[PDB]
Amino acid sequence: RRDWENPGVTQLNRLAAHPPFASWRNSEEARTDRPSQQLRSLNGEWRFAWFPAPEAVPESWLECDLPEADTVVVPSNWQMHGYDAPIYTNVTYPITVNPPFVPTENPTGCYSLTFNVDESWLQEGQTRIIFDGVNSAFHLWCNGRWVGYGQDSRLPSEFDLSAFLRAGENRLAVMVLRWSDGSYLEDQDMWRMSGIFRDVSLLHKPTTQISDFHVATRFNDDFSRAVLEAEVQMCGELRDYLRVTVSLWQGETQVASGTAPFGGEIIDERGGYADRVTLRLNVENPKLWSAEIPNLYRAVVELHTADGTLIEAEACDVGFREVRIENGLLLLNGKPLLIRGVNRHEHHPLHGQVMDEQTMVQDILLMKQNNFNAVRCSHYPNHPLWYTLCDRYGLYVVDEANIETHGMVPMNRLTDDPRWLPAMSERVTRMVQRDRNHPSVIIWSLGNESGHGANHDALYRWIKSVDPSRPVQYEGGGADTTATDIICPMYARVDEDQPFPAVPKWSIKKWLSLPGETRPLILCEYAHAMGNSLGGFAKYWQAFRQYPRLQGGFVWDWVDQSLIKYDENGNPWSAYGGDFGDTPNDRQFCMNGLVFADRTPHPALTEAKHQQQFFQFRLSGQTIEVTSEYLFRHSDNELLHWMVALDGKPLASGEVPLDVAPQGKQLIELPELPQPESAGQLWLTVRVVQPNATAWSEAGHISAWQQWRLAENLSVTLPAASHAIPHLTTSEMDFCIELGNKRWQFNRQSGFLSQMWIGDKKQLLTPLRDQFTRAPLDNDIGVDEATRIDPNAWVERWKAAGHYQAEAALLQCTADTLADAVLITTAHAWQHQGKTLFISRKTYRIDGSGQMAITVDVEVASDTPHPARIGLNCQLAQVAERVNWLGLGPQENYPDRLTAACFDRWDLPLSDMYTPYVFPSENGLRCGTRELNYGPHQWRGDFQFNISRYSQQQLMETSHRHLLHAEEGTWLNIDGFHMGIGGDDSWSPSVSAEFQLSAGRYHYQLVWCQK
Amino acid sequence: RRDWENPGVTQLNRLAAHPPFASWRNSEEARTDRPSQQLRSLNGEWRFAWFPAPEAVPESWLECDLPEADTVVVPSNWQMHGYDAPIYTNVTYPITVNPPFVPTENPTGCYSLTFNVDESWLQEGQTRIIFDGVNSAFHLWCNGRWVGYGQDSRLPSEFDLSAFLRAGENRLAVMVLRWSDGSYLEDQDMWRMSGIFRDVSLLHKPTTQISDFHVATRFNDDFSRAVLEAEVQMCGELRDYLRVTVSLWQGETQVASGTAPFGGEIIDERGGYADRVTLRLNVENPKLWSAEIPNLYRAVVELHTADGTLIEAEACDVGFREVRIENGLLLLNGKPLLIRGVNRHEHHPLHGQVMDEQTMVQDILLMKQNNFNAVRCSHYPNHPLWYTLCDRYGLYVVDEANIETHGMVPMNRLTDDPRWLPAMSERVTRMVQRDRNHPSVIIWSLGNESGHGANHDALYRWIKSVDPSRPVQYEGGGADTTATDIICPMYARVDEDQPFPAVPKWSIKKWLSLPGETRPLILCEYAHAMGNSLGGFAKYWQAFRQYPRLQGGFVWDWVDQSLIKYDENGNPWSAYGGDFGDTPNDRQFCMNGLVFADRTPHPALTEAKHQQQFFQFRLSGQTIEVTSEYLFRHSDNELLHWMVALDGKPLASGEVPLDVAPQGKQLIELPELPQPESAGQLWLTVRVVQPNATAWSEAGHISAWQQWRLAENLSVTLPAASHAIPHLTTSEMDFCIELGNKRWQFNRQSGFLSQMWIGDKKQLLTPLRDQFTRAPLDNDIGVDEATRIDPNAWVERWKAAGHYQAEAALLQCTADTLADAVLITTAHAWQHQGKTLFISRKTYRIDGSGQMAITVDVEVASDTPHPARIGLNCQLAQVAERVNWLGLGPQENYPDRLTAACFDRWDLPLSDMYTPYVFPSENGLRCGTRELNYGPHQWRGDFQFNISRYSQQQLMETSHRHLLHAEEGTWLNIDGFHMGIGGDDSWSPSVSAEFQLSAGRYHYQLVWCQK
Ligand SMILES: [Mg+2]
Ligand SMILES: [Mg+2]
Ligand SMILES: [Mg+2]
Ligand SMILES: [Mg+2]
Ligand SMILES: [Mg+2]
Ligand SMILES: [Mg+2]
Ligand SMILES: [Mg+2]
Ligand SMILES: [Mg+2]
Ligand code: NA
Ligand code: NA
Ligand code: NA
Ligand code: NA
Ligand code: NA
Ligand code: NA
Ligand code: NA
Ligand code: NA
């Protein structure tokens, strides 16, 4: 019947959706959340054979294992075992757009398992199989007989096997299709994979059973009284002796309990639900759930006879919290939230889209350690364990339906079509039925990038009707449609409007106050963290803090979707789109994470942590004012450490207990600090330290920091009068300068310093030259292709203007002998096709102390695109182990992403001065640097620098980090000025005006000496 | 696969729904609505075989005609051809409630047709087959090859036959199932039938085609300017040369036109619809559509080339009107509606549920002639022609989705279940897609009696999104849920609350002003017209007129659902539930009509016509004030006739043209009327007559009437002195009175007048006795049955109290001789089990003029249920041809249903004094009667009476009208007092307090003489 090419058939013989069941037959096991004998895992070694189409599958496979089959681990994606290629495409569907049809060549995965069933399971009750995740559609047979069919890759499909099984050995056969009509609703920007990629389980339920239960918590005005309402539904043999008991536990203490027979209130002319009961439990002074303090109770639902026979028990964690929107604000337990969120795909570099507990916990720990309090399930319901972990560790969750039709033209072509309403309804309704009891879920989402269709409006109303406890949001069709309670745009900028036709992205500040608008605004996606990014992140956070109705957002996104491949030597490397022969593909656009695929942080993670801090600081004279942004908790695991240093030299430090109420303030007066006689800038650094370990952090965890300049004493002392005078030697081709053990050589044809000697050892492999370009960042490139040129992207503007190919023409090169120095004066013009782009005028003053003072003045043509940098570069002959600097660090920082960096004396291995972005670009810059030390060299001034074994040219020319080779010596880039990195999005120019090098004239000065 | 036991499969290979198409290939034929050669009817003689289940159908039937098959007319219901029994059940499902399963014995109708097509249809283009109505589900084969499957009995199912067609003879095979999962949504209170019961057609469209079009009309503040917006969608290959023109025609004049290429506005990030276009046409001073003046334009939609070649055209009638709810009022073109509505099922006594143009037109004519302006499609989409007729004749329509789940427990079991959302959605969405261009449709309804579920809220929102031009209503779950724009209760009473748990029926006046309530109230069902009913109808209309937000209602219902059966002699009779061996059944509950099945009016229809009049009248002195209730039309076809009569004798008359603006008033001063010295009451009668014929009425049509009492001159003159004196003869057993040739005999054992003679001829066949009971009306019975007794019903209260069994104990019987008269005095006690129910005290005075004056004083025990009547009855020996009376008439009238009746001298054949209700009961009463003449007899007083060949006993004991036999002589019932008939509903006591006989003591007087 080709059910996989029919959106009218999304399942056959599939059981109703419900909250997580375990069918405990002992109430104490249910209370403690211990394993249930009635819930078995079928994970492990299965048999697998790959076919190019379902028509290629032999009939014998239904009755008998195929000899050519392999033994593989389940859950798995079959692409991860090498059976066919994973495909990375963003918007464009991986199949021809011809709904509801899929390709005749439809990769088919034939899974089978021989497994044991105990006689006891078949003597009574009901045995069901549960497939938590099958991508994208499947038929199931048991012992050769057809059972049913399922679609929706991201929710459990359950089938009754009671009539199919025999005692002892049984065989399942599962035919999994890569493509189905469901694929039209699964166009998320991610790797396209397939298989049985979540858990498989066997569940025994009694004939008379709990078939559904809902838990709600309502509160009085000040949250001092609550009512827990539990609606319980049964299936099977309905009798007067039946009862439900709901008991509520706080650890080992029972706080509340209620018992009732079945038979709900009358609801209409035909009566009520005889198979339902609602229990209402009064709870005095409930401990409330938040991401700050994830207080949980345990609810045990016992189905039993009145006279005391437990039939079965189910249970869940209960978090007492109210979510409501009032007067334009999203409130949790009466207080306005500030969402420090991130979007998180389910991705593992080795296992693909298979999730494990260890990876989930690792992610949650890192998120909380970096001041995140919220996660969006981009863009599908997650593995069931995710919600349990968010309940327990404390993260707010946006649970999102598995509906994305991005590649349709227009985007709402399916979502406005009533014929696709059934398929869409199932993806929304079965999510809600599964996840509605989790306190961590605070907002429902209708899916992602599917335009706005009448189906969205219908399903919005459905959710509002069945679950009034949670707002519903949806970004499609302009972010503020009738299908959303929250204005939830993606990549709307802070101040700048983007007035696209039909779906404009207004400035978020402006959006709030459009005529008639009252809703809160929380960005579903913002700060696109692709490669060297998160420029302008601080601008979002300032706006969030200033505007009550700007309640935060979810960063895009958590983890790079890179996959591991192996070279000829068997060494692993990170692969992206196209690396598996997948075509068409979207190359590196799958890597947008704050962390690498192996969960190593990108530098941008520290900027997020800092801007998302829960304590705010102000300094007034000697007094530090600390303000708490916590809504519910006191600062009961926090001390403030302070330190004052003079140009990195510690002068005084202390620690003070933090005792701040939520939303409260504490004033801390610093002790009397002695005025230092020595020249330099005094800097105050404060850090909030957590003395005690928590569920999510180690003792000594730093949660917040801030820095201020204190008193500065400008140096007025003159350097000691030099004994010697440098000697100049002139030839037609060179100016040569000598002083003691030092020599400098300036080439008179090029006008550059071409060599230096310390003692007898040469210092340069390439001359010291101006540099006005950078190896383009992902944000500089956007959607620019070799086959599809985007002329608006920064890289294309620079290329078209000739920035990368401009040749220095020498205008002036002179030498003068002074009383105590030699002065070299140069001027160069950079030209492309008769156009002068830049002029650089320099002096080099070499004095009797051996120091070389370099003054640089640059003119930039007003009509050329603003340059990426204004600086110098050279390749140093030496490779040293360490890099030591006085300036911002320790991590990579750029002009629009340097708030997290602190001014101090930093010392790192050379390798740490390179950031291994999978797609290579300009990287490793440190800004605000006053002194740099490397080998025998010292540079002083006020500059930005990077230092590495890789030239800008190599970074520019290499597509993958594993293909980079260390060059001879060390490439040094020292910039007077560097352009912002941007990142509001990564497909259009996003560098704000104040971070563009538009001044026309630029001045910087450096001293180069030997330390 | 048993697709008929799966609510997830409602169709296979079915084409999208759309407005009525004809694929005109000539624009003038489209404009004039003439036949299209591309649309063929397949109605006529088909081959048919009946089977007990689909499993019994032989495979050979797919390939060739079954020899055992019969030739039958299609469309038809196979029950009407006698292949199996139609079932009448109200609430209880006709199948075991076990969703989604149906009985294994599932009557299966195998239809086939041999046909050929035009050569050119085999050449190119798309040939589809359209089944307008198949009950309840079907599979389709063409030339032995399976095509598809369909459900929903009340909307067209269309399938592409292009790839199945062959040269020469083709064969259709249609397997129709009586029961399917669709049956769970089709539990309407009606006969349960099956088959291909609406049209079958073939439609040949081009491959490049108009696939959908929507027409909208928006207005400025005073309706002097309109914009017609037409959205047009195509299927097939897009070409740059393609255009759409929409032209608007007022008869033969083109008033507006717009032309554009395809390609709609940008709607999201992916662009717009390249396969759609919206045309906007400015219309100055549009003629507006209303039921009062159904002004229509013709919209012609042409798919054509830029250089003028027509590809195809579609078209519809356009009515310019705005429907909105504002400030709690339902407005049409800015004016508040008063709905004079009726519910109408599609029913024919011979053809079952097959509708034809002639019957539809007959219904509309009768509805408009009886002052109805609105119809509710209870409870499913109607035959497509219905809406066209309502567009053109002018009736407001509520279009209702084919969803009723009344028999579920509770009522919302399916409608609150997300697994039934897909099946429900199609029944709503496909109705809107079909009917949205009809101006007569002003309100969408989500179905009937299915409780209130989340699926209702979802679909409510879907309609509001897709079609903002019409309010959405739904009565289920308490009539004021979140799924309705209009408070739309069924059988809510005017003043009396019915505070049922969960779903109370408040007094409609009270309902409006409940805290927070703002919506209009229009009863979806009221005034249940079952048998002798419509008591208290005037109370509704008084309330509707007084309360702005009470905007009327829909009477239940238009036509009795009786079916024709034939007796042994071939004579037809009207049959109801159970008469076909159908069991369980709900007997006469299928007959609730204002008209009989053959469209003959019940007496109740005139009460409806009168109360629904469009002119209101007041009298002050000699001035008649006429007020128009029309919203839009002037009284341009109206003449007022007035007449004054003294006790039925015409005294003066005249006529005046009505010249009244909508909502306006006209004063008409009556001339100087001559004062009659002759005693009696003067009565004024006015009637509004339409001099000119219309589309819906004949010349001379009476649309309104009213009566007033004018001057009364009481008679003070004494009658002529008696010439003779009556003589008394006494025996132990009798008092006999003689005067001339007249004799009266009073039985001294019984205490009643047992005989009268004129000469030798006996006048009585049964003695003249008190009567306190009536043959129970349907309203007296309710849901009371032999198997399940309902003690609250009036009939059960009367039976339990012994009213029907009470025996007359004689207390007193005396005779006195006066100066000119003989006086008989009697007293009787009616008792049951020692309890005295009633006491009757009488005097009979027989004077020398031969007149018998009867004075009756009755005492009714306060603790007995109030009696049905207080009167006398006898069986007269005489059978005469005519009945002449001075009182209310000419039609049957009761105390709570007599406003339409007029006081005058009436003269009818005896048969007209009997109302042939299919279920026999008390009938034919006429009230307010001062004089009754029958043969030689005259009765005078102030009484109610009925007169017929049927005793109350026979009417009470006979289940069907055709089983009644004329008894010897004539049964006369003369009541001093008669109880109301009620009818607010027919399953609970509904007679209002003021019409119950609760006064305890009653007096009346009569004179019996020979004329
Ligand atoms: Mg499918
Ligand atoms: Mg216990
Ligand atoms: Mg046993
Ligand atoms: Mg997308
Ligand atoms: Mg700072
Ligand atoms: Mg079905
Ligand atoms: Mg019903
Ligand atoms: Mg009247
Ligand atoms: Na805010
Ligand atoms: Na991406
Ligand atoms: Na503390
Ligand atoms: Na690169
Ligand atoms: Na009204
Ligand atoms: Na009925
Ligand atoms: Na007139
Ligand atoms: Na009867």
Side-chain angles (χ1 to χ4, degrees), chain B residues 781-801:
Chain B
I781 297 163
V783 293
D784 166 59
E785 210 175 39
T787 48
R788 187 154 286 178
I789 304 292
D790 179 13
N792 192 41
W794 277 107
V795 76
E796 285 303 313
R797 297 194 219 166
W798 294 325
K799 280 163 69 182

Side-chain angles (χ1 to χ4, degrees), chain B residues 629-939:
Chain B
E629 286 187 300
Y630 286 111
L631 304 174
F632 312 113
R633 74 172 286 272
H634 193 88
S635 68
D636 61 8
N637 189 20
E638 276 91 359
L639 177 67
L640 190 83
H641 284 270
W642 65 268
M643 106 92 145
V644 177
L646 179 72
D647 295 341
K649 302 163 280 174
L651 188 276
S653 70
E655 65 178 58
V656 186
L658 284 186
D659 195 342
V660 63
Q663 306 289 292
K665 295 176 192 298
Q666 177 180 343
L667 304 178
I668 297 163
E669 204 216 8
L670 297 170
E672 195 266 333
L673 304 159
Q675 280 82 61
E677 285 172 304
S678 179
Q681 177 74 71
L682 288 167
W683 285 84
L684 171 65
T685 308
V686 302
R687 70 189 217 271
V688 177
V689 173
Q690 303 180 174
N692 305 126
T694 68
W696 56 271
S697 60
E698 297 179 67
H701 175 72
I702 296 162
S703 63
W705 62 95
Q706 189 53 273
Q707 276 201 321
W708 299 263
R709 287 177 174 88
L710 303 184
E712 182 176 38
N713 295 301
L714 298 170
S715 183
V716 291
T717 52
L718 293 88
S722 301
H723 311 89
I725 174 168
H727 290 141
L728 174 64
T729 303
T730 296
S731 66
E732 187 189 29
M733 191 52 62
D734 295 285
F735 293 128
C736 297
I737 298 95
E738 189 175 54
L739 184 81
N741 72 320
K742 297 172 190 172
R743 285 173 288 158
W744 298 259
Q745 184 186 243
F746 290 84
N747 189 289
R748 294 180 73 183
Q749 191 171 73
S750 73
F752 298 116
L753 175 72
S754 61
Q755 195 54 263
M756 284 177 293
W757 293 267
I758 281 92
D760 322 73
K761 299 182 175 184
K762 302 173 178 177
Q763 301 295 302
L764 302 176
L765 302 173
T766 300
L768 179 71
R769 294 169 58 99
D770 304 76
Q771 188 175 224
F772 300 105
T773 56
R774 70 187 177 196
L777 317 174
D778 279 315
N779 291 338
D780 297 335
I781 297 163
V783 293
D784 166 59
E785 210 175 39
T787 48
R788 187 154 286 178
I789 304 292
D790 179 13
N792 192 41
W794 277 107
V795 76
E796 285 303 313
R797 297 194 219 166
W798 294 325
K799 280 163 69 182
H803 287 202
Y804 291 102
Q805 285 178 31
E807 299 202 312
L810 182 61
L811 302 179
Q812 178 200 222
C813 187
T814 65
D816 291 288
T817 307
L818 309 177
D820 70 311
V822 175
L823 180 77
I824 310 291
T825 312
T826 69
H828 290 89
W830 278 261
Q831 299 171 311
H832 184 73
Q833 295 172 357
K835 163 76 186 175
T836 305
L837 306 170
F838 325 109
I839 293 168
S840 174
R841 296 175 173 92
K842 302 189 204 69
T843 61
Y844 305 74
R845 194 182 185 272
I846 296 157
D847 74 342
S849 69
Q851 302 193 146
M852 177 177 60
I854 313 173
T855 304
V856 185
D857 291 280
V858 166
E859 215 173 341
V860 182
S862 74
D863 61 340
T864 203
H866 310 318
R869 47 148 55 93
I870 294 169
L872 307 167
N873 88 312
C874 65
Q875 189 179 8
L876 303 169
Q878 213 230 359
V879 177
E881 298 188 319
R882 313 293 297 185
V883 177
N884 178 285
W885 81 103
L886 180 70
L888 299 177
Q891 297 185 63
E892 176 192 276
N893 57 90
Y894 284 81
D896 56 346
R897 200 198 72 221
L898 53 63
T899 66
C902 290
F903 186 92
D904 217 309
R905 170 78 59 183
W906 307 107
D907 191 303
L908 292 179
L910 180 59
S911 60
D912 280 2
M913 305 308 288
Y914 158 74
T915 308
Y917 295 116
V918 175
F919 178 82
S921 72
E922 156 66 36
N923 72 92
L925 200 76
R926 267 77 168 171
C927 295
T929 296
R930 309 306 296 277
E931 182 193 304
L932 173 60
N933 301 294
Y934 186 67
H937 305 291
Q938 183 183 86
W939 302 265

Side-chain angles (χ1 to χ4, degrees), chain A residues 610-611 705-708 898-901:
Chain A
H610 180 60
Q611 285 301 320
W705 62 94
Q706 189 52 266
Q707 274 203 316
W708 299 262
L898 52 63
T899 69

Side-chain angles (χ1 to χ4, degrees), chain A residues 444-583:
Chain A
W444 299 114
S445 174
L446 299 174
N448 188 63
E449 297 175 316
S450 301
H452 176 232
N455 298 352
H456 287 120
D457 291 328
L459 293 171
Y460 166 88
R461 185 66 191 103
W462 183 87
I463 301 178
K464 300 289 278 181
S465 181
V466 306
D467 179 26
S469 76
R470 294 170 177 99
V472 178
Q473 76 170 50
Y474 178 60
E475 181 278 341
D480 60 3
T481 66
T482 51
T484 191
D485 290 331
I486 302 168
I487 307 158
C488 53
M490 57 178 65
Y491 317 106
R493 298 176 182 193
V494 176
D495 300 301
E496 180 194 352
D497 289 340
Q498 301 171 82
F500 306 120
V503 287
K505 296 184 192 303
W506 306 114
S507 149
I508 61 179
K509 292 181 197 173
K510 172 190 176 156
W511 210 321
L512 285 180
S513 58
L514 293 178
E517 190 53 73
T518 54
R519 288 169 288 182
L521 190 158
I522 300 163
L523 294 121
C524 73
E525 301 175 24
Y526 82 112
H528 197 259
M530 183 179 181
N532 194 349
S533 196
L534 239 79
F537 195 67
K539 194 176 285 177
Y540 279 100
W541 284 89
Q542 188 281 328
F544 298 160
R545 291 183 170 103
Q546 179 173 22
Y547 285 65
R549 281 174 53 220
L550 290 183
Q551 292 183 264
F554 299 84
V555 172
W556 189 273
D557 66 350
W558 179 244
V559 57
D560 278 349
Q561 293 187 56
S562 58
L563 291 171
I564 296 297
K565 284 178 71 80
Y566 299 91
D567 66 20
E568 299 283 60
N569 300 319
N571 293 309
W573 55 273
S574 298
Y576 53 77
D579 287 333
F580 297 89
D582 47 311
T583 182

Side-chain angles (χ1 to χ4, degrees), chain A residues 1 3 6 8-9 11-12 14-16 91 139 266-276 406-413 416 418-419 421-422 425 429 433 451 454-455 457-459 461-462 465-466 475 482 501-503 505, chain B residues 1 3 6 8-9 11-12 14-16 91 139 266-276 406-413 416 418-419 421-422 425 429 433 451 454-455 457-459 461-462 465-466 475 482 501-503 505:
Chain A
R1 267 228 183 142
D3 297 300
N6 180 6
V9 177
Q11 57 80 32
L12 293 164
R14 185 161 70 181
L15 300 173
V91 177
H139 281 284
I266 293 162
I267 63 152
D268 53 51
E269 294 85 348
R270 294 287 281 166
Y273 285 94
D275 52 345
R276 298 184 189 181
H406 203 157
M408 294 306 298
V409 176
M411 213 186 299
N412 79 347
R413 186 171 286 276
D416 202 45
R419 310 199 89 187
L421 179 58
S425 77
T429 64
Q433 288 180 295
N455 298 352
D457 291 328
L459 293 171
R461 185 66 191 103
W462 183 87
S465 181
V466 306
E475 181 278 341
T482 51
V503 287
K505 296 184 192 303
Chain B
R1 276 229 179 152
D3 298 299
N6 181 2
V9 178
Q11 57 79 31
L12 298 161
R14 186 162 69 186
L15 299 170
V91 175
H139 280 284
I266 295 161
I267 61 154
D268 55 50
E269 293 85 350
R270 296 285 283 168
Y273 285 94
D275 53 343
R276 300 181 187 181
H406 203 159
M408 296 306 297
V409 179
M411 215 185 299
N412 81 345
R413 187 171 287 274
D416 203 47
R419 309 201 86 181
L421 179 58
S425 69
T429 64
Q433 290 179 299
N455 298 355
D457 292 320
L459 294 173
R461 189 58 188 104
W462 182 88
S465 297
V466 170
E475 178 280 336
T482 47
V503 289
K505 295 185 195 300

